Design a protein around this ligand. Structure first.
Ligand SMILES: N#CCNC(=O)c1ccc(-c2ccnc(Nc3ccc(N4CCOCC4)cc3)n2)cc1
Length: 296
């Protein structure tokens, strides 16, 4: 419960709220305190962690939900494991990677995404889940080099047994930088569950690009950069994204030095197969996981 947690330092702040390192019984925990404008995401994520009972070594480990009243307002808390290395966005700016380190990160992310997408049938089986806002800032780096996925407030669920679709009721929109072309020009079929899985794939390809840039080969390595850093400004608008992703059909450039390394070359082909304008031509999360397991 919140009254037993000592907030020790703020490690994040934004439109979503803020993220704190706290102590509970003398050991670290992560507390996300949701902004007023993002209450729906707390409700959605509490449903997944509590009712569906989501857990997996590549999904941020849940501890508890709670409401606490403070300063004459009521706050919505989400308490989870603490990872001192921060998010992949922070980690990649402080270190380069070797071949084995680079492959763990991208294999563990694909392993997390596959768990979400795949339905487990039976008595109390988890439905299929699409994330819908995957990015490097809501993926965490664990001390064993593997990653885990967080920030599930936009998720959509599906069960083929009943074949009903639960899109929830959240006014939040995805991060514009990572938006997929069928989103930016409003052709995505909102009634078909596969549509949301193919959105996660597009975003996964971008994160794969972000990480591969940091792997060293033959003494060469790129600085960290976010997707489309060279053609859109910070906090880009819906219109900016569409000009780049739809009108000009642009994609993150493949650095030429990648073509003198066998791992980076196999990862480049995988990226491009996540980036088709035609959403149904993209690979599945399971396909990606399998391919990454055989690359070395
Ligand atoms: N933008 C955006 C959305 N991000 C999140 O919702 C989010 C971010 C982080 C965590 C989270 C979870 C567990 N542990 C941690 N640890 C953490 C440690 C260091 C940092 N720092 C980043 C800034 O500089 C100092 C290190 C951030 C998070 N974060 C959970 C949700």
């Amino acid at each position: 419960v919140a009254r037993d947690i000592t907030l020790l330092e703020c490690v994040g702040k934004g439109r979503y709220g803020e993220v704190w390192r706290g102590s509970w019984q003398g050991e670290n925990v992560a507390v996300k305190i949701f902004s007023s404008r993002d209450e729906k995401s707390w409700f959605r994520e509490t449903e997944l962690y509590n009712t569906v009972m989501l857990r997996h070594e590549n999904i941020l480990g849940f501890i508890a939900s709670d409401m606490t009243s403070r300063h004459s307002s009521t706050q919505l808390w989400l308490i989870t494991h603490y990872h001192e290395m921060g998010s992949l966005y922070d980690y990649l700016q402080l270190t380069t990677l070797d071949t084995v380190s680079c492959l763990r990160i991208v294999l563990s992310i694909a392993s997390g995404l596959a768990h979400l997408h795949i339905e487990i049938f039976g008595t109390q089986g988890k439905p299929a889940i699409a994330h819908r806002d995957l990015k490097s800032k809501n993926i965490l780096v664990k001390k064993n080099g593997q990653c885990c996925i967080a920030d599930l407030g936009l998720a959509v669920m599906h069960s083929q047994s009943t074949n009903q679709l639960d899109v929830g009721n959240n006014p939040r929109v995805g991060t514009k930088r990572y938006m997929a072309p069928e989103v930016l020009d409003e052709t995505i079929q909102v009634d078909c569950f596969d549509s949301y899985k193919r959105v996660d794939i597009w975003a996964f390809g971008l994160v794969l690009w972000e990480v591969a840039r940091r792997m060293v080969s033959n003494g060469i390595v790129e600085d960290y950069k976010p997707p489309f850093y060279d053609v859109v400004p910070n906090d880009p608008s819906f219109e900016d994204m569409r000009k780049v992703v739809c009108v000009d059909q642009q994609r993150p450039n493949i650095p030429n030095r990648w073509f003198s390394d066998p791992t980076l070359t196999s990862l480049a082909k995988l990226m491009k197969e996540c980036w088709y304008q035609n959403p149904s031509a993209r690979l599945t999360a399971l396909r990606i996981k399998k391919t990454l397991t055989k690359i070395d």
